[PDB]
Structure 1
Amino acid sequence: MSLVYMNIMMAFTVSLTGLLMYRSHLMSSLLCLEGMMLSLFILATLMILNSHFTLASMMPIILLVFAACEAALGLSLLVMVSNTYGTDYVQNLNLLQC
């Protein structure tokens, strides 16, 4: 198929493996999650413009709106975590081992 689809899929896998490998922060995890959303947006848009399927032109906007509301919800969870522990470090979220 098209060559750009390989690159957008590989960008999704890069932000996947970044989201699937935490370093220290939770904000870096949310940035990798929204990079995954960005690659979904681009790849869906290239398919829909590529096929001239008219009605699905409203699909990437709905993807954007729902996952940005999801991003706001995750930022609110991050705010509550950082207010509890002082930092957004994921190693402070460890009380559920016992």
Structure 2
Amino acid sequence: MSLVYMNIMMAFTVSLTGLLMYRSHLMSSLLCLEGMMLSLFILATLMILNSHFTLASMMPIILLVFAACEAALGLSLLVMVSNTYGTDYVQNLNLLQC
């Protein structure tokens, strides 16, 4: 198949490995998650436009809307834990080990 498909898959894999290995902050995890969504957007849009599937052109808009609502919920959770601890570090979310 095509080449830009390979580049978008590799971009998605890079963002997934970024999400799956936290460094210090929760915001970097959210950024990696939203980059994953952006790669999904580009891949689906290219496939739908190249395939001339007319009625599938509405799908990336719904995908963008739902994942941005997801991101709003995640930002609210990040703000709540930052108000609790004074920072958004992932090492402070360890009370539930016990």
Q: TM-score, normalised by structure 2?
A: 0.99
Q: CA deviation at 1:27?
A: 0.3
Whole-Å Cα distance in 1 between the matches of residues 10 and 73 of structure 2?
27
Q: CA deviation at 1:13?
A: 0.4
Whole-Å Cα distance in 1 between the matches of residues 2 and 50 of structure 2?
10
CA RMSD of aligned residues (A): 0.3
Q: TM-score, normalised by structure 1?
A: 0.99
Number of paired residues? 98
Q: Which runs of 4+ in 1 moved over 2 A?
A: none
CA offsets 1:50-79 (integer angstroms, 9 cap, x no match): 100000100000000000000000000000
CA offsets 1:4-23 (integer angstroms, 9 cap, x no match): 00000000000000000000
Give the equivalent residue in structure 1 for 2:57: 57
Q: CA deviation at 1:82?
A: 0.3
List gaps (5 residues or longer) in structure 1. none
> What percentage of aligned pairs have identical amino acids?
100
Q: CA deviation at 1:81?
A: 0.6
